[PDB]
């Protein structure tokens, strides 16, 4: 199918509490390979996938150097932003940055993105066309004007259409056993009596990759969305995921319900019935 490479950066100012915390994580699809922490010992970009571990000193030095410049940039950002909003110095604040590129089945560039949040709400985002920006408020306008002035978007676009798709593809080939796989979910159902007149029916999808998956319950063909308890898709820890969906069934009615599992790794929807 299609793939994507994305980098996520978090910076939090620690008033009088040493420099601001900087955390950077890199993913191809739902798998991580990089990760940098200001509090960590190494002060290096560190490998977090097997297929990236033997990239070579040139790579790691180059990646360490750059992510260090990202951390300086964000530390400088937390002050500028404190300015735009006339905030005090005593408080902790958050900057969040994500950028990356999606490629299609052909592994050709599909789209790029570049988003920025302050205190957990949109601040500024490069738009579809990779030419124009969306500013969230009066403060982000100034940034917009500054970035337009400096052709920030052009330099972003060059990265997303070249370097980003280029290395995504290197990784995809290099980690093909991990990155190019699809683990369809192992599915099962469980039944627990709530009472002598109710029972909880739970649909499990386990050990799947990638994370996108739809689990739904029907009763006689009709989707029980309002009455379905659904948990967020969660990491298992081994690079796979899990999810479950539950409904409460009157005892005796288990046969009226079906669970439907859709996942890229399944040659076709999966209808489950407690029988």
């Amino acid at each position: 199918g299609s793939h994507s490479m994305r980098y996520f950066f978090t910076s939090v100012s620690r008033p009088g509490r040493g420099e601001p915390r900087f955390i950077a994580v890199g993913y191809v699809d739902d798998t991580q390979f990089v990760r940098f922490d200001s509090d960590a010992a190494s002060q290096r970009m560190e490998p977090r996938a097997p297929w990236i571990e033997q990239e070579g000193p040139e790579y790691w030095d180059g990646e360490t150097r750059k992510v260090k410049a990202h951390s300086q940039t964000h530390r400088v950002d937390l002050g500028t932003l404190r300015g735009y909003y006339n905030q005090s110095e005593a408080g902790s604040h958050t900057v969040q940055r994500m950028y990356g590129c999606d490629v299609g089945s052909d592994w050709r560039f599909l789209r790029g993105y570049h988003q920025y949040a302050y205190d957990g709400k949109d601040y500024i985002a490069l738009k579809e066309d990779l030419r124009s920006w969306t500013a969230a408020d009066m403060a982000a306008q100034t940034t917009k004007h500054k970035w337009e002035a400096a052709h920030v978007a052009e330099q972003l676009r060059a990265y997303l259409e070249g370097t980003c798709v280029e290395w995504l593809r290197r990784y995809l080939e290099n980690g093909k056993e991990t990155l190019q796989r699809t683990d369809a979910p192992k599915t099962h159902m469980t039944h627990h009596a709530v009472s002598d007149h109710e029972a909880t029916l739970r649909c499990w999808a386990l050990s799947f990759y990638p994370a996108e998956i739809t689990l739904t319950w029907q009763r006689d063909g009709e989707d029980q969305t309002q009455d379905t308890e659904l948990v967020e898709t969660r990491p298992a820890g081994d690079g796979t995921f899990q999810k479950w969906a539950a409904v409460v069934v009157p005892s005796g009615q288990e046969q009226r319900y079906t669970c439907h599992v859709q996942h890229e790794g399944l040659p076709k929807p999966l209808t489950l019935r407690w029988e």
Binding site: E63, H70, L156, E166
Partner: peptide, 9 residues
């Protein structure tokens, strides 16, 4: 590979 790049909000 991360961005190479500067910036400054």
């Amino acid at each position: 590979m991360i961005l190479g790049g500067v910036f400054x909000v």
